[PDB]
Write a structure and sequence with these properties.
binds 2-aminoethyl naphthalen-1-ylacetate, Protease (chains A, B), protein-ligand complex, 99 residues, homodimer, aids, seven-stranded mixed sheet, Cathepsin D, subunit A, domain 1, mainly beta, Cytoplasm, hydrolase
Chain lengths: 99, 99
């Protein structure tokens, strides 16, 4: 797709057998989502840094589907106030900024 | 240009007769930059909301040049820890997300 930015670029994502909504956020390095169960061995990760950090669970090699494009990569899971698709998974689906 | 997202999409911007570096941040609604002098009548604006707010000066109809594309729009100026080009000015230069 080609997505304009008049409004927030919210998309529905397929992940862990469930549907969530997430923001395509080029300003985010990583992908962070609300609590859910995913497969694999996870380890804690401290994220943020500007004003403090929050702890999330890092799950690697997770499969996601965005707008019907599949990708594999790291998903951070925990109390995020905002579900974001970050650059790590944007690259995987071949998403670029164009003007 | 077409910008991939392996790395942070930092660009040099021309604004207020000066050069700054800013991040193209589709996750940001507004454009927020470090202290500088701009023309016009400004009014204070509280931004953020998640954990608190910071106060910035809102300058409207400011001219900016990004990667050699010019645009006019609102620039928020103040103590931001991160210079970001938000969706308000991304739309102006015709920037889209593509995959
Ligand atoms: N556009 C990059 C900034 O966008 C984010 O950083 C998303 C996000 C991810 C994890 C925690 C957060 C907490 C507060 C506010 C945004 C947060
Ligand atoms: N007064 C505490 C507010 O401080 C924070 O909220 C830090 C923080 C922690 C995790 C993720 C973030 C994302 C964006 C911006 C700040 C973030
Ligand atoms: N990707 C959207 C989240 O990106 C931002 O929100 C940029 C930004 C703008 C103003 C103040 C901030 C304070 C802390 C952390 C990021 C901030
Ligand atoms: N403990 C205070 C940390 O709380 C904040 O830092 C709130 C805040 C204010 C302005 C801009 C933001 C942008 C992203 C994330 C939080 C932001």
């Amino acid at each position: 797709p080609q997505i304009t930015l008049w409004q927030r670029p919210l998309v529905t994502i397929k992940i862990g057998g469930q549907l969530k909504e997430a923001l395509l956020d080029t300003g985010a390095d990583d992908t962070v989502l609300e609590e859910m169960s995913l497969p694999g061995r996870w380890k804690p990760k401290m994220i943020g840094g500007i004003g403090g950090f929050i702890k999330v669970r890092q799950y690697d090699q997770i499969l996601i589907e965005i707008c019907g494009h599949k990708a594999i990569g790291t998903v951070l899971v925990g109390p995020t106030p905002v579900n974001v698709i970050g650059r790590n998974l944007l690259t995987q689906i071949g998403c670029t900024l164009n003007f």
